[PDB]
Design a protein around this ligand. Structure first.
Ligand SMILES: NC(=O)c1ccc[n+]([C@@H]2O[C@H](COP(=O)([O-])OP(=O)(O)OC[C@H]3O[C@@H](n4cnc5c(N)ncnc54)[C@H](OP(=O)(O)O)[C@@H]3O)[C@@H](O)[C@H]2O)c1
Ligand SMILES: NC(=O)c1ccc[n+]([C@@H]2O[C@H](COP(=O)([O-])OP(=O)(O)OC[C@H]3O[C@@H](n4cnc5c(N)ncnc54)[C@H](OP(=O)(O)O)[C@@H]3O)[C@@H](O)[C@H]2O)c1
Lengths: 206, 206
């Protein structure tokens, strides 16, 4: 495998769990960073390596990024809508570790609202969106091979692999299943065509 | 009222660098205080005078402010996530020096968090915001002609000189390009109309 060792940040989350499951099935050697209180469920797929720590600690991020071929970022705040910098500060640490360890490919999830008219972002989501904006700027300015994944509403529909990928603009549907979103994150590992672009995956489930 | 000589503090930062470049291109005679002169560009527009020193050192500040017509403040301490007084202590040194040398005009950047509810501030940004508030009070209480510039998110969009400025309140957009922010800092040197006001520059970027 050209890309074989990957770090996943946010593997315990909604999209992270199915991205991990798909990655292990596809043959990836996956390292995860998990917070001490929230390990992966006993019964799910097992990653190759587990680092227990916090994306806010450079040391823990360093341990997770060392030796990888690529990084997938699915960080979030589990529907807590309070003001936060955990995603942008975590991205700062990931960028610094990637530069220090010679890793170039990062596929990182923010949100479709970064392709919206900002005056139409729902105010309830503005605080989280503000940190997505901060995070995207950190990654865009890094100079790394950065795929900016900007999905609409993440749903519970099936894995299809049949979704539309819209480049640098809003796509034709307003939903992507968490399984398809994880499928796309992994697809981004084996092609350079989305590097330096914003990508909006969306689908109609029928 | 005619401003030819200015000091810029924070000239090596994100906004400082483009403010400096625009100031030099426009004809200002620019003095900068830098801790490390290698962080200034070797090419293109260069300041007329470089003082090497620290805004925490009153003598370094005094030498920067001497002979100026106005002062631009673009200090920041982005890494400080716990109580910090660098900006407010710097502002105290700047105010004392301006008074000692008869400089009457200061245009200083804090943040639009000073116009929003305090619960909007992410926990890790509370220390910087608290010190922005401390710096703002120092400048308001000085009796100097003070334009408070309180920008939203600072982006990297090209210079567009077409932004909106909202007075003593927040405006419709929540982004300002660093280039447009620098452009507005310099515009504040050419008029009295913003003295004693808070200003919110923002724009929609096409
Ligand atoms: N909700 C939507 O419909 C929607 C639409 C577009 C975009 N998005 C954005 O898409 C991204 C992924 O969403 P999601 O629902 O899949 O994620 P999620 O369920 O919120 O999972 C967040 C992940 O980030 C981890 N995490 C949080 N803080 C961490 C920290 N300090 N250190 C280490 N790991 C940390 C979490 O670990 P723990 O298990 O320890 O909590 C979890 O694994 C989010 O940024 C979300 O805002 C969501
Ligand atoms: N980033 C945003 O979106 C945003 C939004 C609203 C408000 N703001 C605020 O806008 C202001 C400017 O932001 P920025 O990103 O352009 O600043 P920045 O890139 O963080 O640069 C900070 C400047 O302050 C200088 N500085 C720091 N400590 C100093 C010291 N002891 N002595 C002398 N110089 C010192 C720095 O010099 P060195 O190069 O030597 O470090 C640098 O030139 C900040 O106060 C920020 O909090 C930012």
């Amino acid at each position: 495998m050209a890309v074989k060792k990957i770090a996943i940040f946010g593997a315990t989350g909604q999209t992270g769990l199915t991205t991990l499951a798909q990655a292990v099935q596809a043959g990836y050697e996956v390292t995860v960073l998990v917070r001490d209180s929230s390990r992966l469920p006993s019964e799910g797929p097992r990653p190759a390596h587990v680092v227990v720590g916090d994306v806010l600690q450079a040391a823990d991020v360093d341990k997770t990024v060392a030796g990888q071929d690529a990084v997938i970022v699915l960080l979030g705040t589990r529907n807590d809508l309070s003001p936060t910098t955990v995603m942008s500060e975590g991205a700062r640490n990931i960028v610094a570790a990637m530069k220090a360890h010679g890793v170039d490919k990062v596929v990182a999830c923010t949100s479709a609202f970064l392709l919206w008219d900002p005056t139409k972002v729902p105010p309830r989501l503005q605080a989280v969106t503000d940190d997505h904006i901060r995070m995207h700027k950190v990654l865009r300015e890094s100079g790394l091979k950065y795929v900016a994944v900007m999905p609409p509403h993440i749903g519970d529909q099936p894995l299809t692999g049949a979704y539309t990928v819209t480049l640098d603009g809003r796509g034709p549907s307003r939903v992507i299943s968490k399984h398809d979103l994880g499928h796309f994150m992994l697809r981004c590992l084996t092609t350079d065509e989305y590097d330096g672009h914003s990508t909006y995956p969306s689908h109609q489930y029928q």
